[PDB]
Amino acid sequence: PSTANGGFPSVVVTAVTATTSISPDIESTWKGLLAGESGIHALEDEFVTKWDLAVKIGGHLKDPVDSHMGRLDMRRMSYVQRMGKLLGGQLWESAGSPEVDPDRFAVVVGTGLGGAERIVESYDLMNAGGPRKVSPLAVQMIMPNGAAAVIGLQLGARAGVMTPVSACSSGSEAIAHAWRQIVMGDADVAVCGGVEGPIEALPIAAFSMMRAMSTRNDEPERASRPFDKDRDGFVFGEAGALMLIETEEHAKARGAKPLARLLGAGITSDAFHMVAPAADGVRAGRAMTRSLELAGLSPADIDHVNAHGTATPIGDAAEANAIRVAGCDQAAVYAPKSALGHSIGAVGALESVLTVLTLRDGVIPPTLNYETPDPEIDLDVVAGEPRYGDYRYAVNNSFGFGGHNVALAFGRY
Amino acid sequence: PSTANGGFPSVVVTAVTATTSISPDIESTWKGLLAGESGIHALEDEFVTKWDLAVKIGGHLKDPVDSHMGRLDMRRMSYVQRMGKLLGGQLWESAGSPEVDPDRFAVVVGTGLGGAERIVESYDLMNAGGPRKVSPLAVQMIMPNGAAAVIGLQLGARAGVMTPVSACSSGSEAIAHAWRQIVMGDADVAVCGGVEGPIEALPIAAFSMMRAMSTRNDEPERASRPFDKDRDGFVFGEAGALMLIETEEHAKARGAKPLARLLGAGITSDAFHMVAPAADGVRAGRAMTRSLELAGLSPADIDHVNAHGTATPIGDAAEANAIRVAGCDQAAVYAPKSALGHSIGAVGALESVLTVLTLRDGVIPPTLNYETPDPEIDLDVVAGEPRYGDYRYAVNNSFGFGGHNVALAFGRY
Numbered sequence: 148p149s150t151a152n153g154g155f156p157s158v159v160v161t162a163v164t165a166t167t168s169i170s171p172d173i174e175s176t177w178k179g180l181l182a183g184e185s186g187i188h189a190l191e192d193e194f195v196t197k198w199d200l201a202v203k204i205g206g207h208l209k210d211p212v213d214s215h216m217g218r219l220d221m222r223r224m225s226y227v228q229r230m231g232k233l234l235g236g237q238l239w240e241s242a243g244s245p246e247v248d249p250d251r252f253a254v255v256v257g258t259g260l261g262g263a264e265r266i267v268e269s270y271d272l273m274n275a276g277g278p279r280k281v282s283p284l285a286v287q288m289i290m291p292n293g294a295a296a297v298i299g300l301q302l303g304a305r306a307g308v309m310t311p312v313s314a315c316s317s318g319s320e321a322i323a324h325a326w327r328q329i330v331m332g333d334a335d336v337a338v339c340g341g342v343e344g345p346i347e348a349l350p351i352a353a354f355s356m357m358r359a360m361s362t363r364n365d366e367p368e369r370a371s372r373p374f375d376k377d378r379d380g381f382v383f384g385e386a387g388a389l390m391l392i393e394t395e396e397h398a399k400a401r402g403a404k405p406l407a408r409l410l411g412a413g414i415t416s417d418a419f420h421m422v423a424p425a426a427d428g429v430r431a432g433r434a435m436t437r438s439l440e441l442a443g444l445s446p447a448d449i450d451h452v453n454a455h456g457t458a459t460p461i462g463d464a465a466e467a468n469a470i471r472v473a474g475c476d477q478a479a480v481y482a483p484k485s486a487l488g489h490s491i492g493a494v495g496a497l498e499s500v501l502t503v504l505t506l507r508d509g510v511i512p513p514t515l516n517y518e519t520p521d522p523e524i525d526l527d528v529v530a531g532e533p534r535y536g537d538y539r540y541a542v543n544n545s546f547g548f549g550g551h552n553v554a555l556a557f558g559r560y
Numbered sequence: 561p562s563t564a565n566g567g568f569p570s571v572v573v574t575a576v577t578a579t580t581s582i583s584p585d586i587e588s589t590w591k592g593l594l595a596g597e598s599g600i601h602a603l604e605d606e607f608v609t610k611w612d613l614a615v616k617i618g619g620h621l622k623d624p625v626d627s628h629m630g631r632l633d634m635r636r637m638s639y640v641q642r643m644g645k646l647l648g649g650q651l652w653e654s655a656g657s658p659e660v661d662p663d664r665f666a667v668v669v670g671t672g673l674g675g676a677e678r679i680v681e682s683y684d685l686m687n688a689g690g691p692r693k694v695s696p697l698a699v700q701m702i703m704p705n706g707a708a709a710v711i712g713l714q715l716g717a718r719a720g721v722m723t724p725v726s727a728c729s730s731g732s733e734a735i736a737h738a739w740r741q742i743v744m745g746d747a748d749v750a751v752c753g754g755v756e757g758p759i760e761a762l763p764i765a766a767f768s769m770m771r772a773m774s775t776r777n778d779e780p781e782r783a784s785r786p787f788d789k790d791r792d793g794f795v796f797g798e799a800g801a802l803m804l805i806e807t808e809e810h811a812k813a814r815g816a817k818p819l820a821r822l823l824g825a826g827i828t829s830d831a832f833h834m835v836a837p838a839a840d841g842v843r844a845g846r847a848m849t850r851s852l853e854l855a856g857l858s859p860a861d862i863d864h865v866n867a868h869g870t871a872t873p874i875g876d877a878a879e880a881n882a883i884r885v886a887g888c889d890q891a892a893v894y895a896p897k898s899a900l901g902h903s904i905g906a907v908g909a910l911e912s913v914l915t916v917l918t919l920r921d922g923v924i925p926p927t928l929n930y931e932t933p934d935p936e937i938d939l940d941v942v943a944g945e946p947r948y949g950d951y952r953y954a955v956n957n958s959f960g961f962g963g964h965n966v967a968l969a970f971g972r973y
């Protein structure tokens with residue numbers, strides 16, 4: 148059974164929304180990327196100087212979430228819940244605010260951590276003034292399922308509200324599970340993607356102590372260098388992204404113009420290391436292959452790969468092998484983290500949206516800072532200027548800390 | 561397409577393990593439940609007196625997790641990761657330490673929050689001595705996928721390692737996603753269940769401030785009263801539980817004796833309120849109905865319902881209506897939280913293990929403290945003494961905060 152042979156129903160993407168370090172509008176982010184713009188700049192936050200952080204570069208949201216948040220929302224929601232509500236409403240507006248059947252409507256939103264800022268706040272409030280100072284809203288804000296719950300409550304999703312956690316692959320895995328919920332018959336329509344918290348001292352400190360982050364502080368826009376010889380780790384780039392997916396029949400019934408097709412989703416694991424990807428990239432490649440199997444495609448059909456491309460030395464090397472294992476080494480490769488950075492749980496979702504626009508507009512943006520290619524890798528990396536091309540099919544890769552491999556297979560409508 | 565009509569492959573439960581407030585051995589916990597034992601006692605912890613908490617009753621694990629943990633594990637892992645390692649090894653040994661194909665082996669372990677203690681630790685450390693005092697493993701310990709990532713690395717699962725966060729239904733949802741992974745053909749064997757943190761002052765404060773918790777401190781063992789007229793909220797009971805599921809062919813090939821059959825799983829949502837369940841129980845009942853559709857069963861086939869049964873006035877009323885909607889109100893109902901309390905993300909997995917043991921031994925333990933029937937409920941609640949029977953099929957219910965509904969359909973082997 149596959150999408151090609153009619154074993155699974157046809158699933159199409161009908162709307163996308165995203166907020167990034169370049170722009171709060173996905174179509175503006177897309178234009179910026181095509182122009183070779185970067186969202187990564189020098190961090191001017193006071194916490195950088197306070198702690199004298201080794202990492203002084205980051206990509207803040209161009210339009211911060213809380214600028215669209217009144218006092219009420221600031222009191223009753225965690226940050227990721229607030230981002231979810233914002234993106235949830237924008238997405239629904241862009242889809243024409245359709246009246247769908249709630250019992251056939253599901254929500255699957257991934258996240259890296261959850262409402263962690265409310266944990267420390269409640270911790271502090273209890274330490275200072277005792278258990279009565281902990282809010283009765285604390286549980287619903289802290290719980291990592293909260294963002295998905297807020298969106299499901301907002302839009303009225305009654306065919307399931309799910310939250311997969313797989314670190315960097317959470318946003319892509321969310322879309323994978325949304326696809327599954329539809330193809331198994333549990334829903335006809337689904338909002339899916341990923342949300343994540345902002346850059347701060349403690350996140351910077353924590354990830355910096357892993358020694359996986361770039362420290363090229365003097366040249367922020369040149370710091371993130373996926374598949375480049377002079378790469379020194381990943382760069383934080385704040386993001387949130389959701390897409391609306393549904394059966395082609397459902398889309399056709401309400402007159403929705405599809406942006407792209409979601410043909411298959413592959414989920415595998417390494418069982419190798421807690422934070423480092425497997426060097427051979429076999430299991431990561433198997434995730435790509437599995438998505439092709441479910442889509443009913445062969446590697447030869449894959450014209451484009453939106454790479455995970457963290458810019459860690461071992462990460463990019465592993466992925467290069469992974470693509471080769473999947474037999475997609477002839478595909479045109481893009482590494483959006485070169486310009487948008489790493490948004491952890493949201494990044495798989497943001498990059499899935501980018502893959503949809505690639506297929507829609509038939510153009511791949513240039514991978515920034517790809518000046519001196521790494522001799523070992525040997526990939527067809529799109530760079531210099533955007534590459535216009537006849538892209539029929541694409542695979543979006545997302546590989547998370549813990550050994551989590553998610554591959555999504557998309558097709559041009 | 562169903563399990564009955566051969567649409568899905570036959571999936572069987574071949575091994576179980578759990579640590580509870582009654583015992584570290586699942587077979588001993590099971591005997592205790594049949595004898596009418598309770599794991600809920602007066603909390604002798606210092607934080608109870610220190611803060612003068614409204615709740616002074618809880619069920620700590622009989623055998624603490626850390627009593628099996630050395631110095632490396634205590635510094636390199638979070639609590640839920642440590643619980644995961646322990647139960648992971650115990651399950652594998654109970655299964656006969658089989659040599660499975662890692663590429664067809666998956667792990668799905670749910671949890672409520674994650675390595676939350678390491679967040680407040682990192683926060684305190686950084687505030688005291690700056691960013692360099694934060695642990696290098698802070699990220700891999702804090703990340704909520706960490707428990708599942710530990711177990712997948714421990715046992716060598718390469719067909720996917722996933723963590724669903726669904727609050728009270730996390731453990732059940734994990735089994736649900738494990739079932740899905742096997743039936744869609746991505747794996748043949750799967751370790752699945754749930755883990756959760758211990759009882760502490762802040763967890764108590766957070767849940768008790770919602771007025772969700774029982775305050776019957778004078779009589780700890782009589783506090784948790786699911787479906788009883790005089791019920792006043794849930795009681796904390798620490799737990800962790802995992803089960804080994806696999807296809808019947810795979811089980812037969814290695815000579816593994818099945819304990820029960822996993823026939824189907826239904827996942828729906830309320831989209832009603834952030835913490836309160838929907839009064840009508842319609843979507844909760846649809847979760848039950850969906851598990852039957854996929855199992856290939858009818859409501860008449862269901863002889864047993866392992867209820868969510870938290871003992872909240874609102875929660876039990878909703879579940880009573882949900883069972884009516886599913887057409888399962890003539891089924892024999894058991895509420896294990898009466899004796900084992902609420903373990904949040906692990907409780908759905910624990911009660912799935914209890915459902916398996918019920919179908920294996922053909923006996924339902926008594927629902928503790930069910931003395932005065934509530935007029936509104938009108939359920940056949942097993943109480944006073946255990947009820948023996950040739951039980952053919954059972955449905956395990958989990959309805960978590962956020963409106964997440966998971967129903968698991970089990971069958972006698």
Ligand SMILES: CCCCS(=O)(=O)Nc1ccc2cnn(C)c2c1
Nearest residue numbers: 260264344345346347350383385491
């Ligand atoms: C730009 C992505 C990095 C953020 S993180 O990976 O540390 N997750 C994260 C999640 C929630 C909150 C709330 N406050 N903060 C600071 C958070 C951080």
Ligand SMILES: CCCCS(=O)(=O)Nc1ccc2cnn(C)c2c1
Nearest residue numbers: 673676677757758759760763798904
């Ligand atoms: C017995 C179930 C209640 C625990 S909870 O729902 O508050 N989750 C939880 C998870 C992790 C940790 C670590 N320390 N602590 C205290 C934790 C607590």
Ligand code: NA
Nearest residue numbers: 453454455544
């Ligand atoms: Na990607």
Ligand code: NA
Nearest residue numbers: 866867911957
């Ligand atoms: Na149950």
